[PDB]
């Protein structure tokens, strides 16, 4: 067969250890999920430094410790007018319960008469999107280093029955060590079985979302396929002037690859960008292992990635500098509106 005794024993032991890790991780998540933290700081603990439809994201400095943070500010009356109560509550509830090295950390949260505040660790490299458009495309080893972190993060999230549903370079921050931080859990949902909401970004939508079917966590594995393609090509597999033309391409079962893609990469992508759910990697009897054991990941040391011991291929220019972010006009922050609705926050 493909593996001799030694390799087969090592792989089996590694897979059993993953199961053991995930079982403990689920116990810890569920304790925090059932008893969320609340009101762990206040606004005058922070200096506002710079702005980076529901609200704003600001770089702030903790007055006592000097640490910088990215503070998400949501206007309560505006969340309720846009029908975003459940999504806002759920995002904060998820963030305070999860713990993984590639998931942004919620360090504090609180509220006042007018706003909700989520104080996140500041990730100074900015979004992968900008780096990818600047560099053009990532070489396959560079793409694979990021892809491996998303695989591990989805393995973690899916074990908690969380579906993520908005993977894209725009939502991937690069930290000072060159590792990924997944941000933005506004569309994530705890889903044991199927769910039905039309949500996501057009280029990253799985066919079963477009075709108005009930769907499951396999939509995240489709989206990983789109992400790996876009990272390695510099453009996504399915694009057009208007979303409806993108969707026609997504459901067609046809994808074309640049000539510089390796055969291993094309094979992986054909199995992730698989319209037939009975054939899509991540959705089969062997689960995430079909992805982790694919030839394209043969050089990936999954534990070393998790332990952040792999030298990253790219370190963003390390100037609390805002070198890797844009500039915006600075409106003020004024302050008991919408009390009942946000009792749980």
């Amino acid at each position: 067969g493909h593996m001799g005794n030694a390799a087969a024993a090592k792989k089996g032991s590694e897979q059993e250890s993953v199961k053991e890790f995930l079982a403990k991780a689920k116990e810890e998540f569920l304790k925090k999920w059932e008893s969320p933290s609340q009101n762990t700081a206040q606004l005058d603990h922070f200096d506002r430094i710079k702005t980076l439809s529901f609200g704003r994201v600001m770089l702030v400095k903790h007055k006592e410790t000097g640490n910088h943070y990215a503070m998400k500010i949501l206007d309560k009356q505006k969340v309720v007018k846009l029908k975003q109560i459940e999504h806002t509550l759920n995002e904060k509830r998820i963030l305070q319960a999860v713990n993984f090295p590639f998931l942004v950390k919620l360090e504090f949260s609180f509220k006042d008469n007018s706003n909700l505040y989520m104080v996140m660790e500041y990730v100074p490299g900015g979004e992968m999107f900008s780096h990818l458009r600047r560099i053009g495309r990532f070489s396959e080893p560079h793409a694979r280093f990021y892809a491996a972190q998303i695989v591990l993060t989805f393995e973690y999230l899916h074990s908690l029955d969380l579906i993520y549903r908005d993977l894209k370079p725009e939502n991937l921050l690069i930290d000072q060590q060159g590792y990924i931080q997944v941000t933005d859990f506004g569309f994530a949902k705890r889903v044991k079985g199927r769910t039905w909401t039309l949500c996501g970004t057009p280029e990253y939508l799985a066919p079963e979302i477009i075709l108005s079917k009930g769907y499951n966590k396999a939509v995240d594995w489709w989206a990983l396929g789109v992400l790996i393609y876009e990272m390695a090509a510099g453009y996504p597999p399915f694009f057009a002037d208007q979303p409806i033309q993108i969707y026609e391409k997504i459901v067609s079962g046809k994808v074309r690859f640049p000539s510089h893609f390796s055969s291993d990469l094309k094979d992986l992508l054909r199995n992730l960008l698989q319209v037939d759910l009975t054939k899509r990697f991540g959705n089969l009897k062997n689960g995430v292992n079909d992805i982790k054991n694919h030839k394209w990941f043969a050089t990936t040391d999954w534990i070393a990635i998790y332990q952040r011991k792999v030298e990253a291929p790219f370190i963003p220019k390390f100037k609390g500098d805002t070198s890797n972010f844009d500039d915006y006009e600075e409106e003020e922050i004024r302050v008991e509106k919408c009390g009942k609705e946000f009792t749980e926050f």
Partner: peptide, 18 residues
Amino acid sequence: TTYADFIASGRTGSRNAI
């Protein structure tokens, strides 16, 4: 070329959710 088609799509900037 595909790259030219991507530029022509007008969807090279940040993409919003639906």
